[PDB]
Design a protein around this nucleic acid. Structure first.
Ligand SMILES: [Mg+2]
Ligand SMILES: [Mg+2]
Ligand SMILES: [Mg+2]
Ligand SMILES: [Mg+2]
Ligand SMILES: [Mg+2]
Ligand SMILES: [Mg+2]
Ligand SMILES: [Mg+2]
Ligand SMILES: [Mg+2]
Ligand SMILES: [Zn+2]
Ligand SMILES: [Zn+2]
Lengths: 114, 91, 135, 69, 98
RNA sequence: UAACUUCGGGAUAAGGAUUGGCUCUAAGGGCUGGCAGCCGACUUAGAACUGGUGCGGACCAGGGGAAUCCGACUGUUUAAU
RNA sequence: GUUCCGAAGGGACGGGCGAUGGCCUCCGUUGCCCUCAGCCGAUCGAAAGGGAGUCGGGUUCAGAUCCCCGAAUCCGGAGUGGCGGAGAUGGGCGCCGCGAGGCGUCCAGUGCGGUAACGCGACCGAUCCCGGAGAAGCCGGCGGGAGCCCCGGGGAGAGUU
């Protein structure tokens, strides 16, 4: 079989020196140097282990070339925090403020009583 | 089937380190590799991540605890005594 | 005590308008053929008016006190009911359920909601309904 | 490289100012028109011979046409 | 009164009607058919506050069961976990008339 | 398949038999429409015959047992006695 | 000695003042003042760590992802933005018009779709704050995709006969 070589002056199997095989239009097999596999952003909630959806998973400096719609989603905290924790945050803020109003009015009632 | 008579988890040490050491490490090994029930969700998904750190696979909640057990009798008695002390302090 | 009735303030918990306040204009407690689930036609506000203070010009006040509204159908699961109530006379013949198959009708309904949201906000009641949620 | 599926938009691309030349490829079952713009090579592929020739005459006069084999 | 409420729940789930689970108890509360809601003591604070708010809106009683979801389920006689449940029809039991 | 044993080992303990070629048999599955058709891939077991008893035919490839002394073991050490 | 006993900043949105050029329009150069401003310490340290973006064919005697041909791509820049598209072009009332349509008043217009997860080619916004990526151990098992090997046939050319 045809057994082949590197194409650069780096001859060690490091992280940056990763390759794949491709058959050229000249009926030959060569190495192409692949790009490191990127990751989608992790949620800002700090609880969900999964990645975010609707956001391209690329090496970070590639995100300059992308458009905004391919980077976020149309929602509050779009592309930075997942939908579940968004809705729990909304509910928590609302119910906490309601409880604060309740405790304030009870305090006013107690002040009136005393 | 039952494959061993006395040695359990410490069957992996073979004939080494001595019978007494193997016996006194067996119970700690079982304790640290057991799955505990989470007091926050009710599932038995509590694993020891690192020494003193316990994690729930479902809650994603992390608790500080004993080196080999989820909690220690010293911890529980300190908690009860501290509760009683606060109760007395506020009368 | 069935409480999901027209005039009931709700928070939108999902979709594009997440965390936005809205007021129910129609409720369908048992789903129709197209939507098996219970739902509700609601009209809310998209961009709240900005904080307006004294010592500002009248033009600036009028320009910052502008509301942009939306109208949509939602699930009861995707809506969060509050305890407040806002009684704004939305016109049913223009704000109704067949509006979503024509963009011109949708624009007319949004404008109709917008004008009377402006009116009530300038009157100055329902300040809780008109100040945005901090989440 | 880009593939144009419509004809009049390809005609617009041909009338574009950056178009340097058009080259005509005549292979069996197919006719391809390739316009060389500044950034991309635009290929229009059509399978009808008389459509191909009428398009060839309809090409702009001031742009260098070259049939190749 | 834990023993007596265990007895009443056993009778209620022998005879009357109920729903087990948060996402279905919410549907029952919104439809107004929920006569009583019972919550375990280890359910998430956010959702227990949510359930209390819904019950206040719908004029419905809520009871804080004195055990976590595992033995709330066993008191229900089911072989799984329940955090919140709704009695819709008390049946032949005096759960509402506590 | 023993003594002994820290019950994990000792252990390939020790000791025996078989092994070629050829011709067969049985079992072990997919796809399509308890059946039918069309496809397969390697394995295991058994049998007959047969060779100047020869077969792990070259290559590869643990001698074993009974005891005593010392160090528990794995590991390290005076490059050039 | 490397943040420890330092008055350790020469930056900036904007506002004001002063001058200048360019059709003194509006901006730019600035000069002064007001206002805003944590950095963990200058600097060095990896041709195997981090680090955007180039591949195919041909070409020499000795050089090729470097030369030639052909296809790309990244970064930076651009007064007049070079053009196009988006923003964004609607509704009401009142006249004229048989109508189509047009004239006058008002008013809105920092984009839309989906129950939802999310989608559409754009889709304003500063000091400030929050988060992600960069950013990771060893071993085992299983699955998918390639390249190589293997099998059954078609060609084209060679070996044996
Ligand atoms: Mg490197
Ligand atoms: Mg997106
Ligand atoms: Mg021996
Ligand atoms: Mg002796
Ligand atoms: Mg030794
Ligand atoms: Mg020596
Ligand atoms: Mg350096
Ligand atoms: Mg380097
Ligand atoms: Zn999350
Ligand atoms: Zn848990």
């Amino acid at each position: 079989v045809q057994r082949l070589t590197y194409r650069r002056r780096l001859s060690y199997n490091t992280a940056s020196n990763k390759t794949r095989l491709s058959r050229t239009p000249g009926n030959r097999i060569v190495y192409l140097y692949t790009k490191k596999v990127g990751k989608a952003p992790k949620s800002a909630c700090g609880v969900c282990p999964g990645r975010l959806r609707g956001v391209r998973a690329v090496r970070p400096k590639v995100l300059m070339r992308l458009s905004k719609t391919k980077k976020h989603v149309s929602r509050a905290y779009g592309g930075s925090m997942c939908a579940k924790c968004v809705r729990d945050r909304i509910k928590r803020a609302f119910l906490i403020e309601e409880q604060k109003i309740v405790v304030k009015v009870l305090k006013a009632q107690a002040q009136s009583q005393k | 089937a039952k494959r061993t008579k006395k040695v359990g988890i410490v069957g992996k040490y073979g004939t080494r380190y001595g019978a007494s050491l193997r016996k006194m490490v067996k119970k700690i090994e079982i304790s640290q590799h057991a799955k505990y029930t989470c007091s926050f969700c009710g599932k038995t998904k509590m694993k020891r991540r690192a020494v003193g750190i316990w994690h729930c696979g479902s809650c994603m909640k992390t608790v500080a605890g004993g080196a080999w057990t989820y909690n220690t009798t010293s911890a529980v008695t300190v908690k009860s005594a501290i509760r009683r002390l606060k109760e007395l302090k506020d009368q | 005590g069935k409480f999901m009735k027209p005039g009931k303030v709700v928070l939108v918990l999902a979709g594009r308008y997440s965390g936005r306040k809205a007021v129910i204009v129609k409720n369908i407690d048992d789903g129709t053929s197209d939507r098996p689930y219970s739902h509700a036609l609601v009209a809310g506000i998209d961009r709240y008016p900005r904080k307006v203070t004294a010592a500002m010009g009248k033009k600036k006040i009028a320009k910052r006190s502008k509301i942009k509204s939306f109208v949509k159908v939602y699930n009861y699961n995707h809506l969060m009911p509050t305890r407040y109530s806002v009684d704004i006379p939305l016109d049913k013949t223009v704000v109704n359920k067949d509006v979503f198959r024509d963009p011109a009708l949708k624009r007319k309904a949004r404008r109709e909601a917008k004008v009377k949201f402006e009116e009530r906000y300038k009157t100055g009641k329902n300040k809780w309904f008109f100040q945005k949620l901090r989440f | 490289p880009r593939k144009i599926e419509e004809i009049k938009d390809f005609l617009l691309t041909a009338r574009r100012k950056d178009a340097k030349s058009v080259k005509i490829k005549k292979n069996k079952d197919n006719v391809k028109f390739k316009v060389r713009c500044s950034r991309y090579l635009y290929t229009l592929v059509i399978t009808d011979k008389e459509k191909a020739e009428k398009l060839k005459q309809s090409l702009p006069p001031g742009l260098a046409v070259k049939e190749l084999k | 009164s834990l023993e007596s409420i265990n007895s009443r729940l056993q009778l209620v789930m022998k005879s009357g009607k109920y729903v087990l689970g948060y996402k279905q108890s919410l549907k029952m509360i919104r439809q107004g058919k929920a006569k009583l809601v019972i919550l375990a003591n280890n359910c998430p604070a956010l959702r227990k506050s949510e359930i209390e708010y819904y019950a206040m809106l719908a004029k419905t009683g809520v009871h804080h069961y004195s055990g976590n979801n595992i033995e709330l389920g066993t008191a229900c006689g089911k072989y799984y976990r329940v955090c919140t449940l709704s009695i819709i029809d008390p049946g032949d039991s005096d759960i509402i008339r506590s």
